[PDB]
């Protein structure tokens, strides 16, 4: 339709923003513990999928918790300590989150450049309708 380009770019921007927000939240909760109701904090990731309308935009179905084992730290003085006196610290890969943020920023800038070019082309298109 020559106008689904805007939809594709907007979906890409929204997905990149979601992924960046997830990475930022993980970085903020890198060294947290004992969230609500006492359950240990676990990191989360996002999964990108394409919308087969062929070629289509990107979407994020749901946020998936990481299955990597939590860090078990010996500290009996914490009420969260089990019979072995261990507390469950969250699994956060700082380098992984930095790389994810870098990738999200680069994809966002590429998509905004594509939007700029297509907007210029579409503005120039209407000059022939007179």
């Amino acid at each position: 339709a020559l106008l689904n380009i805007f939809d594709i770019a907007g979906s890409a921007l929204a997905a990149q923003s979601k992924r960046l927000n997830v990475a930022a939240s993980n970085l903020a909760n890198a060294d947290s513990v004992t969230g609500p109701d006492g359950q240990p904090y676990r990191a989360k990731q996002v999964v990108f999928q394409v919308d087969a309308a062929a070629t289509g935009g990107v979407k994020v179905a749901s946020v998936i918790e990481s299955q990597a084992p939590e860090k078990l730290v010996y500290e009996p003085g914490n009420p969260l300590a089990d019979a072995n006196g261990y507390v469950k610290m969250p699994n956060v890969d700082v380098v992984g989150e930095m790389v994810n943020t870098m990738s999200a920023s680069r994809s966002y800038q590429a998509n905004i450049e594509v939007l700029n070019t297509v907007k210029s082309m579409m503005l120039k298109t209407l000059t022939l309708g007179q």
Binding site: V99, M102, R106, Q109, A110, E113
Partner: protein, 52 residues
Amino acid sequence: NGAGLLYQGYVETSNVNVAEELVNMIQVQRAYEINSKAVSTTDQMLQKLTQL
């Protein structure tokens, strides 16, 4: 059948030598810094491409 002997009153200490650990630490730090520079230069390349 290949079993060892027992000495009473003696305890076997850890078989850790610290010189190798320190050298490995130095090498690990240097490799980490060089990989960080690789990440930085690739990010710079991507930024310059996106600023087209």
